[PDB]
Scaffold this active site. Sequence first.
Site, PDB file in Angstrom:
ATOM      1  N   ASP A   1       0.900  -1.108   0.000  1.00 57.13           N
ATOM      2  CA  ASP A   1       0.000   0.000   0.000  1.00 57.13           C
ATOM      3  C   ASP A   1       0.959   1.181   0.000  1.00 57.13           C
ATOM      4  O   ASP A   1       1.792   1.284   0.935  1.00 57.13           O
ATOM      5  CB  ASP A   1      -0.906  -0.041   1.250  1.00 57.13           C
ATOM      6  CG  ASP A   1      -1.648   1.286   1.485  1.00 57.13           C
ATOM      7  OD1 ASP A   1      -1.695   2.140   0.534  1.00 57.13           O
ATOM      8  OD2 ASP A   1      -2.117   1.471   2.649  1.00 57.13           O
TER       9      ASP A   1
ATOM     10  N   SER B   1       0.656  10.506 -17.886  1.00 58.16           N
ATOM     11  CA  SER B   1      -0.591  10.538 -18.633  1.00 58.16           C
ATOM     12  C   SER B   1      -0.581  11.813 -19.349  1.00 58.16           C
ATOM     13  O   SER B   1       0.194  12.726 -19.040  1.00 58.16           O
ATOM     14  CB  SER B   1      -1.809  10.524 -17.688  1.00 58.16           C
ATOM     15  OG  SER B   1      -2.947  11.179 -18.254  1.00 58.16           O
TER      16      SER B   1
ATOM     17  N   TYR C   1      -7.247  14.685 -10.712  1.00 59.52           N
ATOM     18  CA  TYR C   1      -6.479  13.733 -11.510  1.00 59.52           C
ATOM     19  C   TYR C   1      -5.313  14.485 -12.151  1.00 59.52           C
ATOM     20  O   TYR C   1      -4.133  14.059 -12.031  1.00 59.52           O
ATOM     21  CB  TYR C   1      -7.359  13.011 -12.548  1.00 59.52           C
ATOM     22  CG  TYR C   1      -6.598  12.040 -13.380  1.00 59.52           C
ATOM     23  CD1 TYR C   1      -6.133  10.815 -12.837  1.00 59.52           C
ATOM     24  CD2 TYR C   1      -6.279  12.348 -14.698  1.00 59.52           C
ATOM     25  CE1 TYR C   1      -5.449   9.878 -13.649  1.00 59.52           C
ATOM     26  CE2 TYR C   1      -5.555  11.512 -15.467  1.00 59.52           C
ATOM     27  CZ  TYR C   1      -5.169  10.268 -14.952  1.00 59.52           C
ATOM     28  OH  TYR C   1      -4.448   9.456 -15.809  1.00 59.52           O
TER      29      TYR C   1
ATOM     30  N   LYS D   1      -1.326  14.178 -11.826  1.00 61.74           N
ATOM     31  CA  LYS D   1      -0.444  13.859 -12.997  1.00 61.74           C
ATOM     32  C   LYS D   1       0.625  14.905 -13.327  1.00 61.74           C
ATOM     33  O   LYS D   1       1.721  14.523 -13.619  1.00 61.74           O
ATOM     34  CB  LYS D   1      -1.265  13.424 -14.264  1.00 61.74           C
ATOM     35  CG  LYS D   1      -1.993  12.070 -14.005  1.00 61.74           C
ATOM     36  CD  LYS D   1      -0.891  11.039 -13.549  1.00 61.74           C
ATOM     37  CE  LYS D   1      -1.457   9.792 -12.869  1.00 61.74           C
ATOM     38  NZ  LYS D   1      -0.699   8.661 -13.533  1.00 61.74           N
TER      39      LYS D   1
HETATM   40  C1  LIG Z   1     -10.582  15.156 -22.837  1.00 61.64           C
HETATM   41  C2  LIG Z   1     -10.583  13.969 -23.843  1.00 61.64           C
HETATM   42  C3  LIG Z   1     -11.532  12.838 -23.327  1.00 61.64           C
HETATM   43  C4  LIG Z   1     -11.047  12.089 -22.050  1.00 61.64           C
HETATM   44  C5  LIG Z   1      -9.629  11.481 -22.228  1.00 61.64           C
HETATM   45  C6  LIG Z   1      -8.615  12.518 -22.878  1.00 61.64           C
HETATM   46  C7  LIG Z   1      -7.258  11.848 -23.190  1.00 61.64           C
HETATM   47  C8  LIG Z   1      -6.749  11.188 -22.060  1.00 61.64           C
HETATM   48  C9  LIG Z   1      -7.472  10.646 -21.001  1.00 61.64           C
HETATM   49  C10 LIG Z   1      -6.700   9.976 -19.870  1.00 61.64           C
HETATM   50  C11 LIG Z   1      -7.271   8.554 -19.630  1.00 61.64           C
HETATM   51  O1  LIG Z   1      -7.022   8.233 -18.288  1.00 61.64           O
HETATM   52  C12 LIG Z   1      -8.811   8.391 -19.831  1.00 61.64           C
HETATM   53  C13 LIG Z   1      -9.472   9.228 -20.984  1.00 61.64           C
HETATM   54  C14 LIG Z   1      -9.039  10.705 -20.963  1.00 61.64           C
HETATM   55  C15 LIG Z   1      -9.432  11.323 -19.575  1.00 61.64           C
HETATM   56  C16 LIG Z   1      -9.226  13.270 -24.131  1.00 61.64           C
HETATM   57  C17 LIG Z   1      -8.400  14.355 -24.937  1.00 61.64           C
HETATM   58  C18 LIG Z   1      -9.461  14.904 -25.933  1.00 61.64           C
HETATM   59  C19 LIG Z   1     -10.842  14.474 -25.309  1.00 61.64           C
HETATM   60  O2  LIG Z   1     -11.752  15.569 -25.359  1.00 61.64           O
END
Ligand SMILES: C[C@]12CC[C@H]3[C@@H](CC=C4C[C@@H](O)CC[C@@]43C)[C@@H]1CC[C@@H]2O
EC number: 1.1.1.51
Lengths: 276, 276
Positions: free
Chosen positions: B65, B142, B155, B159
């Site tokens: 943990d 990320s 989040y 990051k």
């Molecule tokens: C915000 C967006 C949708 C959500 C997406 C993001 C790109 C990256 C991520 C990080 C991943 O953890 C989940 C999806 C998420 C959170 C996208 C970039 C363009 C789109 O509008």
Amino acid sequence: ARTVVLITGCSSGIGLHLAVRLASDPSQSFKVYATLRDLKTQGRLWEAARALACPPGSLETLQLDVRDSKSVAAARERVTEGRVDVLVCNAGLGLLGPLEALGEDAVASVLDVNVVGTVRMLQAFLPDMKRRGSGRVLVTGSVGGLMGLPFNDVYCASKFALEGLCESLAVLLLPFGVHLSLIECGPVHSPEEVLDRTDIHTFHRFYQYLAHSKQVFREAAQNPEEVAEVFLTALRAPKPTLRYFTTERFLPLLRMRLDDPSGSNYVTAMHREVFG
Amino acid sequence: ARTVVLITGCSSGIGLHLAVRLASDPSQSFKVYATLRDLKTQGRLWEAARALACPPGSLETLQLDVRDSKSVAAARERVTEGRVDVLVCNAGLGLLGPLEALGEDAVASVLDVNVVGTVRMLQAFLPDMKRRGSGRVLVTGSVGGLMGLPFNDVYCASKFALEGLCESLAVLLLPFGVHLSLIECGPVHSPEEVLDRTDIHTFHRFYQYLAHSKQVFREAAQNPEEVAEVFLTALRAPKPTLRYFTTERFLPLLRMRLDDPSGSNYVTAMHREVFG
Ligand SMILES: C[C@]12CC[C@H]3[C@@H](CC=C4C[C@@H](O)CC[C@@]43C)[C@@H]1CC[C@@H]2O
Ligand SMILES: C[C@]12CC[C@H]3[C@@H](CC=C4C[C@@H](O)CC[C@@]43C)[C@@H]1CC[C@@H]2O
């Protein structure tokens, strides 16, 4: 009638200088809640209030510990005018050191105060500005939040936090009429134990690092009066950007970071910049 | 003799897929301590170990943990080989939501696990690699740590933390022979209450946001096998950069951010990108 500004971390420094800059504003257009973690450290705020003759009632101090959202509520609550036009999240801890030499506690505190503190503030103050469709939020940022600085790992970790946090928010706040800005400053006017908590090569590097940054501080530190005035540039802009720089000095260094997304040109530059 | 890799967050996802990718490596060159917050969730790690026939002893699970540095110590300690060649800080919580709707607790936890967790790991594992002048540290990053994503405030805040934290460290680690890399991934394969905790316009925006990101996920999510393989590109590179991207997709969007340091072109782009 007057513009109501609430500001955290007012005992000293940016928050102090700003609080009495707003309060003594000649037009008398601002009502300033200067907050501090403990009221006992309010000596310098008042001395400096007197010196810039803030009229009576342009300036009020509240206790506001951002580690604790019951303090946050109890200070929203002391807002006589029942609104805050301008919220300035200024509270900040630094932390300097080899990462192994930091206590787990201090690391936790820096993030609690800097990042989570600011989260508490917004949660308390955002919703009201959002309904009303007006509100100015200003967040003291740093160059450490724009590029990694050796030996300021956690400091930077917490300053980057705030970039991301504010960036995310601003994309949501665009058409709410609620304005968020980071104000990016560069610098601004026991050995034995660190030696306990680490190797000899690191420590020698730490020494090298401090001697370097002594120099930059002496040659590049700004007046907080120069810094302070950049927040009123932001708070008066009819259409504010997400970001204000107090200086252009570090812009050439930021660009190198921004044109090498593998991070490693910037890693090279900043290494030669600090360890010669 | 074998390369010793310790990895956090192995119950699922990147950490899982990576742990059994390393363990079944045909050359049999890796010894993998897969860590998980609770041993009870180790079902999928083992099922998937069996399926890629990891030999006996190429794979061991420990409880780790990262909220708790006595767990961290007790797991360094279970490292039979008395060293870790490759440390992969993968543990991560997400948090999705209007910022007012998040509990102060959850906000605290995400930062504790993501940022402070990783700080604990390094403090425990760095000093040993530093003496020895060899060591590979890999940190799951990320796109949220590279640009602010609406409704992922905390989040992102966590990051970005990791960018800054790793950036700072890497400038110090350059000539130690200890290598740190972030591995930047994009995506990877109750309403009522959120409505309680916020206004109707936000909520409608949240809905808009989720429908958008449904789309991007379907059209852009990668195999964690594709992701996983980017960590071994990094861990085998004779001279690793600070940063690896699992995809180029978001590079055009990052550049816009990087060429407008006022942040506000990026704010515009990402707004139209998610609220049409
Ligand atoms: C915000 C967006 C949708 C959500 C997406 C993001 C790109 C990256 C991520 C990080 C991943 O953890 C989940 C999806 C998420 C959170 C996208 C970039 C363009 C789109 O509008
Ligand atoms: C790292 C450097 C010395 C330390 C400097 C930094 C610029 C910004 C800051 C943030 C401020 O809080 C104190 C000085 C500090 C921490 C400098 C950029 C170049 C120089 O090497």
